[PDB]
């Protein structure tokens with residue numbers, strides 16, 4: 001038993017981190033096969049005009065102590081692709097995926113091509129992430145592991161005025177309405193990921209925390225009206241279906257758990273805690289709860 | 299900016315995890331150089347786990363009784379010895395993925411990363427703190443025994459914990475890598491209970507300094523306290539006493555923020571009195587005690 005914010009083992013990703021330098025700017029690169037991927041602002045606003053001026057030897061790529069030889073450079077959206085002469089012998093089985101809001105992933109925070117730490121994040125509904133990044137972390141990546149396949153879903157580019165972070169998928173497309181420019185940008189008003197709070201309440205019941213349960217049930221229509229009041233994301237029938245396994249395992253119907261969440265929103269915790277928390281936690285998806293409460297390995 | 303419960307990158311540890319089988323019991327082993335370390339209760343049978351004579355049980359075992367599997371490769375055991383509650387299996391192959399490492403025994407309040415494993419395979423990584431009552435609040439299921447706790451400050455893996463058992467409250471108990479349990483626990487199914495736990499005061503102060511570093515100031519106040527008066531108050535909330543050593547180690551964060559340790563102590567007294575009043579500190583509605591002063595410096599600057 002126990003429930004922790006658990007990240008995926010980062011070993012397969014640590015083997016891909018390299019240091020990329022262009023001018024005075026040093027950040028991280030992701031070395032998969034013979035290509036190094038990094039944020040295009042390493043060359044810094046006309047990115048195609050700035051990239052044309054660059055030679056292959058302008059890009060200094062260092063994989064630990066070894067200097068890699070750049071033999072080509074292209075731009076894909078906000079990501080720079082540096083072709084190198086050596087295929088990374090530590091390239092894991094991998095794919096590039098674009099994630100939806102509410103989905104979680106592990107972040108391997110790096111500085112100068114060296115991994116410093118790993119933690120869990122969720123793609124907020126406002127398309128920002130609440131990460132932990134300092135100067136030099138750009139190029140740090142977010143990922144999930146399924147079986148033996150690493151799915152890369154995020155690359156860090158910038159920090160917004162509220163201390164939250166913005167970045168892209170591994171094809172260079174930003175998550176949210178952000179741009180890689182020094183123009184006024186702000187994170188929109190955020191909402192709570194309802195399906196994730198329900199998954200976390202199921203994890204609390206699995207771990208023997210039951211004070212919030214009740215005899216009541218509700219409808220998807222009545223609950224969604226209450227969710228709207230509290231800046232909660234709408235709960236769809238797909239969400240209800242995804243919660244099916246946890247509902248069957250605990251004997252608590254999804255709309256029964258909705259009545260508990262509704263009462264929790266209108267009345268608060270009343271000094272009580274759930275899984276060592278005084279807030280309703282929304283960064284554990286239904287899959288994360290199953291993956292943890294079942295001990296799935298990679 | 300931002301503040302997260304951040305674990306160390308687990309790659310150097312994943313390369314040391316193996317599966318160890320003896321009889322019907324299967325758990326994890328830590329393969330460093332030519333030795334595999336695992337909990338000694340892997341040699342126990344269900345018929346005898348209240349009062350096992352481990353010395354007597356180990357003398358009956360042959361090298362071929364221990365099945366060690368590193369992924370697909372079966373390792374050959376060529377020796378076996380016991381060091382306290384840890385079994386050391388000498389194997390014929392040195393682990394080519396052995397990192398630079400050392401065994402360290404940690405003090406209560408110290409934090410570490412746990413690499414939770416099942417059948418020699420890593421499932422996940424998370425942060426833990428050695429509670430003042432010498433238990434850890436981990437996340438472990440059946441098959442997680444032998445999973446280890448570690449820190450990777452400056453490219454050397456310091457192993458500090460190995461998982462052995464779950465207590466009735468859902469909390470966990472284990473040993474250092476020399477086999478010595480943390481706390482008054484024993485590897486026997488006799489009635490055991492975790493003592494009353496307390497909050498790690500020096501860690502809550504470190505976390506309030508991290509909130510100030512990240513721009514949070516609502517909880518500060520004009521008041522100050524003596525160390526003695528702060529401790530008289532904090533014991534009434536089941537907080538650990540704050541020693542002069544704790545005040546000294548908070549020195550760097552105090553100088554960085556311009557807030558004296560005893561002024562931050564006054565802020566914590568007020569927070570204990572009033573609660574948060576619907577506010578939050580670093581995305582939390584409780585006072586967080588699993589970030590040490592060193593962790594705050596690591597993650598902030």
Ligand SMILES: *[C@](O)(C(N)=O)[C@H](CC1CCC1)NC(=O)[C@@H]1[C@@H]2[C@H](CN1C(=O)[C@@H](NC(=O)NC(C)(C)C)C(C)(C)C)C2(C)C
Pocket residue numbers: 026027039041133134135136137138157158159160161179180181182183184185186299
């Ligand atoms: C990374 O590229 C890096 N070197 O690690 C760097 C990290 C930030 C976090 C501390 C320094 N990111 C940037 O330099 C990034 C590049 C410019 C401006 N960047 C910022 O993150 C800035 N934010 C910002 O301009 N925010 C808006 C656009 C005003 C909302 C900082 C002020 C935080 C430096 C670009 C291309 C976005």
Ligand SMILES: *[C@](O)(C(N)=O)[C@H](CC1CCC1)NC(=O)[C@@H]1[C@@H]2[C@H](CN1C(=O)[C@@H](NC(=O)NC(C)(C)C)C(C)(C)C)C2(C)C
Pocket residue numbers: 324325337339347438439440441442443444462463464465466484485486487488489490491
């Ligand atoms: C590991 O060895 C393993 N196989 O992974 C296992 C932990 C698993 C089994 C449930 C969690 N540990 C034990 O089996 C451990 C070994 C016996 C009994 N153990 C327990 O953790 C038990 N707790 C327990 O007896 N607690 C006290 C002593 C009553 C307070 C379980 C009831 C959880 C199995 C020993 C030698 C302590």
